[PDB]
Amino acid sequence: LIVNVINGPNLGRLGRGTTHDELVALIEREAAELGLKAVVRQSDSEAQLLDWIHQAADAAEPVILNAGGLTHTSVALRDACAELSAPLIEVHISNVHAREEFRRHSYLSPIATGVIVGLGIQGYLLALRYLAE
Amino acid sequence: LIVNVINGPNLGRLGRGTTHDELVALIEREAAELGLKAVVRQSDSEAQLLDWIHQAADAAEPVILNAGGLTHTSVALRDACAELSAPLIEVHISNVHAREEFRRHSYLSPIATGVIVGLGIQGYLLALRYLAE
Amino acid sequence: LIVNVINGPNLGRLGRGTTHDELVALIEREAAELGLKAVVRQSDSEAQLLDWIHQAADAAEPVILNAGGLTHTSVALRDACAELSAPLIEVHISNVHAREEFRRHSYLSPIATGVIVGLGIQGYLLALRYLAE
Amino acid sequence: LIVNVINGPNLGRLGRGTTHDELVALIEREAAELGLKAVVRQSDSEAQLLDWIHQAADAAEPVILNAGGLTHTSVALRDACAELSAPLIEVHISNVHAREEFRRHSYLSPIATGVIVGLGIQGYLLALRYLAE
Amino acid sequence: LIVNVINGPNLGRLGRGTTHDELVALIEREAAELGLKAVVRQSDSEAQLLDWIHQAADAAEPVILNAGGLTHTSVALRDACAELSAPLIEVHISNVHAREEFRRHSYLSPIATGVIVGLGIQGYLLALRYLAE
Amino acid sequence: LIVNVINGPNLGRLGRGTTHDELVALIEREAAELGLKAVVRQSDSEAQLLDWIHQAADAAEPVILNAGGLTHTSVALRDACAELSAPLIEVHISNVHAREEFRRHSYLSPIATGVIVGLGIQGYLLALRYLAE
Amino acid sequence: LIVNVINGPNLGRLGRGTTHDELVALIEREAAELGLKAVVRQSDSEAQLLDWIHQAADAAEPVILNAGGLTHTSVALRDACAELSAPLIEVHISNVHAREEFRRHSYLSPIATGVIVGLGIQGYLLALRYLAE
Amino acid sequence: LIVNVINGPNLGRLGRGTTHDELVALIEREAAELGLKAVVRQSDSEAQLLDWIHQAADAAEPVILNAGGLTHTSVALRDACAELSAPLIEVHISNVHAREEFRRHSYLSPIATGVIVGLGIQGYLLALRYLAE
Amino acid sequence: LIVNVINGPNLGRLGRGTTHDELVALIEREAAELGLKAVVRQSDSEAQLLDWIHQAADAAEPVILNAGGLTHTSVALRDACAELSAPLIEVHISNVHAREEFRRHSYLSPIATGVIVGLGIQGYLLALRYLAE
Amino acid sequence: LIVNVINGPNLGRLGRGTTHDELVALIEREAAELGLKAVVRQSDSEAQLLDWIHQAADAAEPVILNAGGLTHTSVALRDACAELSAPLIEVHISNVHAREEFRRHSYLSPIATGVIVGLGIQGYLLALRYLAE
Amino acid sequence: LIVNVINGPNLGRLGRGTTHDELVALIEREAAELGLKAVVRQSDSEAQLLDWIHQAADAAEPVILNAGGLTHTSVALRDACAELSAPLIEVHISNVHAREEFRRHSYLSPIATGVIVGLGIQGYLLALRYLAE
Amino acid sequence: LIVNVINGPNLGRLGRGTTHDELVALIEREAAELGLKAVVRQSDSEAQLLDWIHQAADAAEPVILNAGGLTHTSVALRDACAELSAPLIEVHISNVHAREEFRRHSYLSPIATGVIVGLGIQGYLLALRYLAE
Ligand SMILES: O=C(O)[C@]1(O)C=C([C@@H](O)Cc2ccccc2)[C@@H](O)[C@H](O)C1
Ligand SMILES: O=C(O)[C@]1(O)C=C([C@@H](O)Cc2ccccc2)[C@@H](O)[C@H](O)C1
Ligand SMILES: O=C(O)[C@]1(O)C=C([C@@H](O)Cc2ccccc2)[C@@H](O)[C@H](O)C1
Ligand SMILES: O=C(O)[C@]1(O)C=C([C@@H](O)Cc2ccccc2)[C@@H](O)[C@H](O)C1
Ligand SMILES: O=C(O)[C@]1(O)C=C([C@@H](O)Cc2ccccc2)[C@@H](O)[C@H](O)C1
Ligand SMILES: O=C(O)[C@]1(O)C=C([C@@H](O)Cc2ccccc2)[C@@H](O)[C@H](O)C1
Ligand SMILES: O=C(O)[C@]1(O)C=C([C@@H](O)Cc2ccccc2)[C@@H](O)[C@H](O)C1
Ligand SMILES: O=C(O)[C@]1(O)C=C([C@@H](O)Cc2ccccc2)[C@@H](O)[C@H](O)C1
Ligand SMILES: O=C(O)[C@]1(O)C=C([C@@H](O)Cc2ccccc2)[C@@H](O)[C@H](O)C1
Ligand SMILES: O=C(O)[C@]1(O)C=C([C@@H](O)Cc2ccccc2)[C@@H](O)[C@H](O)C1
Ligand SMILES: O=C(O)[C@]1(O)C=C([C@@H](O)Cc2ccccc2)[C@@H](O)[C@H](O)C1
Ligand SMILES: O=C(O)[C@]1(O)C=C([C@@H](O)Cc2ccccc2)[C@@H](O)[C@H](O)C1
DSSP: OEEEEEEOTTGGGOOOOOOHHHHHHHHHHHHHHTTOEEEEEEOSOHHHHHHHHHHHHHHTOOEEEEOGGGGGTOHHHHHHHHHOOSOEEEEESSOGGGSOGGGGOOSSGGGSSEEEESSTTHHHHHHHHHHTO | OEEEEEEOTTGGGOOOOOOHHHHHHHHHHHHHHTTOEEEEEEOSOHHHHHHHHHHHHHHTOOEEEEOGGGGGTOHHHHHHHHHOOSOEEEEESSOGGGSOGGGGOOSSGGGSSEEEESSTTHHHHHHHHHHTO | OEEEEEEOTTGGGOOOOOOHHHHHHHHHHHHHHTTOEEEEEEOSOHHHHHHHHHHHHHHTOOEEEEOGGGGGTOHHHHHHHHHOOSOEEEEESSOGGGSOGGGGOOSSGGGSSEEEESSTTHHHHHHHHHHTO | OEEEEEEOTTGGGOOOOOOHHHHHHHHHHHHHHTTOEEEEEEOSOHHHHHHHHHHHHHHTOOEEEEOGGGGGTOHHHHHHHHHOOSOEEEEESSOGGGSOGGGGOOSSGGGSSEEEESSTTHHHHHHHHHHTO | OEEEEEEOTTGGGOOOOOOHHHHHHHHHHHHHHTTOEEEEEEOSOHHHHHHHHHHHHHHTOOEEEEOGGGGGTOHHHHHHHHHOOSOEEEEESSOGGGSOGGGGOOSSGGGSSEEEESSTTHHHHHHHHHHTO | OEEEEEEOTTGGGOOOOOOHHHHHHHHHHHHHHTTOEEEEEEOSOHHHHHHHHHHHHHHTOOEEEEOGGGGGTOHHHHHHHHHOOSOEEEEESSOGGGSOGGGGOOSSGGGSSEEEESSTTHHHHHHHHHHTO | OEEEEEEOTTGGGOOOOOOHHHHHHHHHHHHHHTTOEEEEEEOSOHHHHHHHHHHHHHHTOOEEEEOGGGGGTOHHHHHHHHHOOSOEEEEESSOGGGSOGGGGOOSSGGGSSEEEESSTTHHHHHHHHHHTO | OEEEEEEOTTGGGOOOOOOHHHHHHHHHHHHHHTTOEEEEEEOSOHHHHHHHHHHHHHHTOOEEEEOGGGGGTOHHHHHHHHHOOSOEEEEESSOGGGSOGGGGOOSSGGGSSEEEESSTTHHHHHHHHHHTO | OEEEEEEOTTGGGOOOOOOHHHHHHHHHHHHHHTTOEEEEEEOSOHHHHHHHHHHHHHHTOOEEEEOGGGGGTOHHHHHHHHHOOSOEEEEESSOGGGSOGGGGOOSSGGGSSEEEESSTTHHHHHHHHHHTO | OEEEEEEOTTGGGOOOOOOHHHHHHHHHHHHHHTTOEEEEEEOSOHHHHHHHHHHHHHHTOOEEEEOGGGGGTOHHHHHHHHHOOSOEEEEESSOGGGSOGGGGOOSSGGGSSEEEESSTTHHHHHHHHHHTO | OEEEEEEOTTGGGOOOOOOHHHHHHHHHHHHHHTTOEEEEEEOSOHHHHHHHHHHHHHHTOOEEEEOGGGGGTOHHHHHHHHHOOSOEEEEESSOGGGSOGGGGOOSSGGGSSEEEESSTTHHHHHHHHHHTO | OEEEEEEOTTGGGOOOOOOHHHHHHHHHHHHHHTTOEEEEEEOSOHHHHHHHHHHHHHHTOOEEEEOGGGGGTOHHHHHHHHHOOSOEEEEESSOGGGSOGGGGOOSSGGGSSEEEESSTTHHHHHHHHHHTO
């Protein structure tokens, strides 16, 4: 049973400790243990992100999404996620409520199933464990 | 190794499905599996909550906190949690970003290690699994 | 048939003309005439107020509530009242719209059946007469 | 002893259960019982409303006012009511704090003796009973 | 099949090119072609406007409305239109989003079927063509 | 040479010292001395006010306007005055900046030639003396 | 004579009744009848949208634009449209004033010739009929 | 009987038609006719302005004040004028409500007897004529 | 002659240098020197704080109050202090204007005699010295 | 050991009871008792105030500052005080939180060591006693 | 020694006088004179811009950035620039503070070394001259 | 050919590295090289600054202005600069967008030719080089 993990702009740069390739490996391993398949994806392109969301909508597949900056700015992304019928878990590696004020609003949260912030890369793994149950 | 799970006002009423006593049992079981001890606590009294936080500060013990309504309103609670040296995970059973606008601000988040909302009672279990690692 | 009349912080001090004990007597008499029983209660403690609301929820009993200052400040109180299935009448002795600006917002009103302000202690009696019909 | 009951724009349409003519009858009956005379009036015209308020000012007669939409919008109406020396009870059939945000501000409340919202057509009768005492 | 075209304050003054009488003629002709009857009406009086809306509510007839200034200011007008069961098309000759900031909010839009701004007098004709289909 | 003096809602009530009839006489006398004719007018009706403004537009006659409450609320009135080609002097008997905050904004001022507030009934006479020169 | 119809992010998904391909056909047919050619285009890519706008600027060709989410968010898109010398009609299938508050602001409207919202796919056809005349 | 006319920063530059020296002459002449003495003064220095206000306070002499930019910015100036026991007329040559938004707030107005804006240099003469009566 | 020193939530934790017990001793000593008696008190309970304020009201005794977080949040506390007839000095150990923005508003200040912030524990002693004179 | 006491605009006018000269004497006496020298200074000139602050910066001398109106308005003054290495005590004779809303913000507080408001002229003496210890 | 000059959306259109190709030539020449190499780049694609920023981060190369509309809207772009270790000069050809209000906020400025606006294409050359020294 | 360089409050204190006298020398040298004369000036006095601006207006000479704190606060200064016919370059040594929020608004920018912030003392030299071309 399949889960999509979609990362947005600047998440390629993870480890400006952990690199993005490692994150894929961690997630892929954790997903194996839980009896899931993780499809992990990254793009700085909104249009590319939207296409992945569209497909997940069509497939009725759940999504773990970390949209980077677009979280606070993209109504379009929000609208594609609003179409998903399966669960959507919004994920942030950092605690967004501990930095600038503008980071404390999210267009995705209201239409998300739930949200995890500030638990680093393990937020992704916790999100997997939710969708497993 | 010990973890405090502190629930605030109105969380006694859980199951206006799951009752609070069951939640304690779920958490206590999940904590056992992870090789932790969970001390779970509930109070409609802010002063009582603050005392539990004080003690966790003194003990250097981590806290999973779901402060109910006081999340959006209590600076005092925020200040007691700010004193905790161990991790603090803020937890909400509901997605607060999907209801009233006033629910989308939290005095605790900025001083928390991280935050989980909208994953129901499993948010508590995911928070345990974080502190385990 | 029973009605709960719950007063919050500072309402013990009524008559810094009429004292709170007199208010209880007025209400108890007026309730008798209407063929009701009034249970009147006062506390400066939010937790104590919440317990009385919880019980009224459980009992399916209606509530006339004057929460004093907590009206403008307590999300927790709002959430306990939101659980009441019977009518909730919000009451204020003073006209709150005639004093400071901060007094002109109420967390309770939106989840209340209705609201009476500025008719003094008779607001309580008018509220009784509503619930009678 | 006389009481004016003034309804504003759209209150002719009551019962898009109860019709406005019935409301007049209810009020007229309830006023009889209390040993008052009710003069009930309705207009979609602000100028017409203002004239009725002017007269009540001049007569020193009290007013129960439900100004419909003009409550949230008319400074002029507010200024005519500010001139009334007798009591002014502001009335709303609906709970205005339960609908749109713009409905939660009133130019009349601060200059009113008091306010009743969300108790339906009985709000008018409760207001009568106040002015009786 | 009948359509009401209601213009509010200051629309008598059209052509401080086209006069209001001409507008009636254009609309009446265009409506003929579409196999409708247009009843066109203008008033600087809110109460008069409300009466026309009431009637359209009662008749279950659709309305094309250009309320002039009252668009940004009248809650009462909004409430009468909210009662209409047939379509309501909000029309503005000018682009309101190109002038003052206060012109960019409308109490009618949220309760309207749809809105046309900045297409001049042809906005009325386009609105007719909608209701035809 | 002619000047229109237009008063809005509640200005009939002047002298809840000076009555409105006296004001007309003062203005008419002062206008005589200056070699003008004053046409003074009062209405609680916005539509009636707008008609007087329309006519002054058409006549190219100047206007001294005290719109009462409608100053802070009417976009429609603003739009009729915006059409006047001759001078428009906005007048207020009271100092509006000394009372409520909502009184300190005016839709008319930006489109007026100028404004006089807080000089009582003499504001009208000063406005006449301007238009004389 | 040519008209560009440009749709933005998520409009490929139309018919999560009508599909986007059908919309192209409707528009192409309606344009034929009016003696126009419609060039219809869709992209989730802002840069791709901007290129189409640039070209329309250069060609001096008019544009009917439905930018989806980017309407409320893109200053860049606004700036490309500001360069168009021919008419620009802003189109929205839904009534944006009936959903979230953030949907009620548009960077495009002020620089657009005019705007149509809430008339579904026929908004595009009405926009064509404008540009025909 | 004496009147102080105090101009603030940038009013030396009048006539970047009329020069400031001419303004003094106009005022001095008009004051003569009214049987007053005008003391006219100008300074770009706030401290210098405050000293003139202090003196007028002490003397119990009235003041016509045009504080230029300091109107919208100086609490200190406001506080010196608040001490004046005689009338204070606030004057602006331009209509401040017709330019930038920041120009539409004044710290002086609330503590002024009254205000004249947009009647050019004659505003000063009208203000004299007030204080004469 | 007696002075009440009331500390609110989290002030038990002073010295997460100086402990609260030491603070009591400092104050008690300083009060002795000034020929006063200091009654010092601390509670994390709002209701408990309110009771101490009530008593001081009744006794007509002055109060030095440091309400911790409740300063920025409690209308109820504000209302109890508003009843005190003797002086009320509001005290804060830290400079509240140097931390978060939310700390820079206080419900108590407007109804306090005066306020001391940022002078550490000596703020209490300075407040004593005021009430001595 | 030296302390600077700097008063700003309008503080010359103290005693529109106590005069400024008396205040200097009180402070000079109290400073003597504490084994300090007080240099007290007053100016309506910001530039003059800034020079005194500059000098105190250079001297590394502490400052007790009551800037009058400039407190709420001067960023420049704030920047000179930010340079002081010794303590800065901000002083206000009145309770600023009890008057207008604009008086409740201060550019100085965040960069001050601490603040005293509403304790009249004794605020200066209390501030001296701080710097003594 | 290398400098990156990155232009965002709509800057291809420069010269709707100077064309973008000319700008490249000007910059390339000016950079030669200063003993630098300029790499100039333009894209309407955010993802493409981000890639260029990433590379400059990795290379530790400085950047002169004119992000067009994305300046006021992109948090993602801000986050990529925040990673640059070398200087970042933000450039705008126009004075953004002289047009719409929304243009007067920039997500880039706070994380930029510095900013140049309103000096036209020479802003780029001035920025080069900075990085030279 | 002459350029005025005007610095405001607190810029005398430069080098609480570089002193103001050095800055004058740098500018004077750089201006020589460019075939200009620099007249550099500094004052903590607004009135003194305004006089220098007036003169530059009269002379039709350009100005490089760094008004310190007055940038964010002085409407008067803004109005004197608005009169300058030659270019006005606004200069800030620091990046104002990287410190407090209040520093991110400027009354001068909208009426300036352009703005340079965060490039230290070289901002002045870059501004010279602009005016040279
Ligand atoms: O913490 C996150 O995962 C977040 O989603 C990511 C970004 C990225 O643009 C920046 C970032 C990139 C990698 C790790 C942490 C932060 C930030 O823009 C978001 O505000 C928060
Ligand atoms: O979702 C939560 O866990 C939350 O912390 C709890 C409350 C409680 O007051 C209401 C509540 C109580 C039990 C389950 C869900 C919600 C709400 O006040 C908070 O806004 C959100
Ligand atoms: O008028 C009320 O009944 C109200 O609920 C009560 C309080 C009390 O805290 C103060 C109070 C207490 C007793 C009578 C009137 C007012 C105020 O805090 C509320 O704003 C209004
Ligand atoms: O609830 C009320 O009585 C109220 O005064 C009336 C209106 C009317 O315009 C609409 C209305 C009309 C009749 C019954 C309920 C509501 C609303 O505009 C007001 O917001 C509330
Ligand atoms: O453009 C409209 O049709 C509008 O509804 C009309 C008015 C009128 O008051 C002014 C007006 C009147 C006639 C044509 C254009 C504008 C304006 O008040 C509205 O803001 C816009
Ligand atoms: O002072 C004015 O002339 C003013 O225009 C008039 C009204 C009137 O509604 C109330 C009024 C009526 C008569 C004299 C003073 C005030 C107020 O509504 C306006 O705010 C001010
Ligand atoms: O109603 C529109 O056409 C609108 O432009 C489109 C979107 C799309 O993102 C969502 C959408 C897509 C298809 C049909 C209706 C709405 C929304 O983002 C806009 O707010 C409104
Ligand atoms: O119109 C006024 O008299 C006003 O008081 C003066 C200024 C002066 O700074 C600018 C000015 C100077 C001379 C004539 C008109 C305007 C402006 O700053 C104020 O906003 C308005
Ligand atoms: O500085 C204070 O004394 C203050 O009243 C106290 C608290 C306490 O909750 C935290 C605190 C506790 C002990 C010393 C300093 C600060 C803060 O909440 C208040 O904002 C400021
Ligand atoms: O209370 C203060 O000392 C204050 O600093 C002084 C002023 C003075 O401008 C007015 C003033 C002058 C003398 C005593 C009290 C108040 C006010 O402007 C400030 O808001 C408060
Ligand atoms: O002035 C700039 O260089 C700016 O960065 C550029 C844009 C461009 O989208 C529009 C533009 C394009 C080319 C020259 C001037 C302005 C605007 O969006 C920005 O607000 C300002
Ligand atoms: O950075 C600037 O040049 C600025 O104009 C100057 C000031 C001065 O008051 C403080 C200052 C003085 C000297 C160098 C940097 C900053 C600040 O007030 C402004 O906000 C910024």
